[PDB]
């Protein structure tokens, strides 16, 4: 089959159960981690930080070194199988901070040559995670700090391009709502098929499930 020999594949079947990636950038104390772990079915790879207190249930692994980060990503297939074997439910893998990934990769490589290598490390990680993402049915989520998400463009470009849904979480009694509605002041994008229509792009008390259901089924 010349079709099979090349990578050509049908879209209707590919978009049916696809596991979307989610990037959520927020200001301080906006409860961004709450959203990612609200489903209580998450594995949090936090970096030099411990915000697992807000989460009620799940598995959390502290990352203290770039070497430690490389190991967990390489053995991530094996890990997911064990937590599921233990009966723990993992549907989403979360990296707590993109800025810390910049800091750790920089230490490993320690100029624009250095910055380009740092970008190369970041792009390589996403490609590796994605091939496993299709294999193990795990949603990926990365979170960062507002300062658009704060970082150097080469990274921002890569993150925004690859990310399916990019959202900004803000608090508006006070209410916690995720707003992905288009806007010049802040940049947000949710990907849905032509037939699917999002009547409301702001979600109050949001969870990863609710977003998934909105992007697969009618809002």
């Amino acid at each position: 089959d010349i079709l099979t020999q090349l990578g050509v594949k049908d879209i209707s079947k590919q978009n049916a159960n696809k596991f979307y990636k989610f990037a959520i950038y927020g200001k301080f104390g906006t409860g961004k981690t709450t959203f990612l772990t609200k489903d209580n079915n998450a594995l949090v790879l936090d970096i030099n930080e411990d915000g697992t207190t807000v989460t009620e249930d799940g598995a959390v692994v502290q990352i203290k070194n770039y070497k430690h980060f490389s190991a967990v990503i390489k053995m991530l297939p094996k890990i997911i199988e064990q937590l599921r074997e233990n009966g723990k439910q993992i549907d989403v893998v979360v990296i707590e901070t993109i800025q810390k990934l910049r800091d750790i990769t920089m230490d490993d490589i320690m100029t624009f040559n250095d910055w380009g290598e740092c970008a190369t490390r970041i792009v390589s990680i996403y490609r590796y995670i994605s091939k496993l993402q299709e294999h193990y049915q795990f949603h990926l989520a990365i979170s960062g700090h507002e300062g658009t998400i704060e970082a150097q463009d080469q990274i921002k470009k890569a993150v925004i391009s690859q990310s399916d849904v990019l959202a900004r979480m803000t608090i508006e009694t006070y209410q916690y709502v995720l707003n992905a509605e288009p806007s010049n002041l802040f940049e947000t994008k949710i990907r849905h098929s032509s037939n699917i229509k999002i009547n409301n792009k702001r979600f109050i008390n949001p969870s990863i499930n609710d977003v998934v259901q909105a992007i697969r089924n009618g809002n």
């Binding site: 020999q5 490389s70 390489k74 390589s124 490609r127 590796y128 091939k131």
Partner: protein, 218 residues
């Protein structure tokens, strides 16, 4: 056919390779290679030191059989290999890097009897499938197309002692693995992994191919 019997003798007496090497003053690496039939030449000094040490006559050390087999592989094989792409670079699964549509060729075997008379048998071997022995390693499997015409070859093979038969099977496989691996490495370009580094060519050379046929049963 001829092989050293050192591995069997040491096992019955229960002596370990390390102790024998320390006493007979022969370097461990050489004694281990000679324990297997891998070495091509043996120094007269080694034959006497070991024979005096294990109170064994030279007769016991070597097993002989007048039979002798020869294998020749076609200079021009028919091979078709189709690149599969699919991002092999991320996960090291050879199947993703390349797929063999069909690889078939002929191996000519001459079973020379103790008498001067010799018999000629011609084997045609074709690709069947790529089995996955372990998650990280695979073994290409090749099956002989014509076996009914060459049934007589089997009668000569099983006549050998078990130790000689195991040696012959290693020899036929080692050559096959080198032949097929060398052909593939040329047609497919190497791909280096993102995350020490294992290039595609190194993985292909490591890969081993074992013939699956009624004639050879072990």
């Amino acid at each position: 056919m001829i092989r050293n019997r050192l591995s069997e003798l040491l096992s019955e007496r229960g002596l370990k390779i390390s102790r024998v090497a320390k006493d007979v003053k022969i370097a461990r690496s050489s004694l281990t290679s000679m324990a297997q039939n891998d070495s091509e030449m043996i120094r007269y000094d080694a034959i006497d030191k070991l024979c005096s040490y294990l109170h064994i006559s030279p007769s016991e050390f070597f097993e002989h059989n007048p039979i002798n087999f020869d294998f020749t592989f076609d200079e021009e094989p028919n091979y078709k290999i189709n690149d599969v792409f699919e991002g092999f670079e991320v996960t090291a699964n050879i199947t993703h890097a390349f797929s063999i549509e069909n690889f078939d060729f002929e191996i000519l075997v001459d079973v020379e009897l103790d008498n001067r008379q010799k018999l000629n048998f011609d084997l045609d071997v074709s690709y069947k499938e790529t089995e996955k022995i372990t998650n990280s390693q695979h073994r290409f499997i090749f099956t002989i197309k014509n076996e009914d015409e060459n049934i007589g070859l089997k009668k000569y093979v099983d006549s050998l002692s078990a130790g000689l038969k195991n040696l012959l099977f290693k020899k036929i496989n080692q050559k096959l693995s080198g032949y097929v691996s060398e052909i593939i490495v040329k047609n497919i370009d190497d791909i280096e992994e993102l995350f020490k580094s294992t290039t595609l060519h190194k993985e292909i050379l490591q890969t081993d191919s074992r013939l699956s046929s009624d004639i050879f049963k072990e």
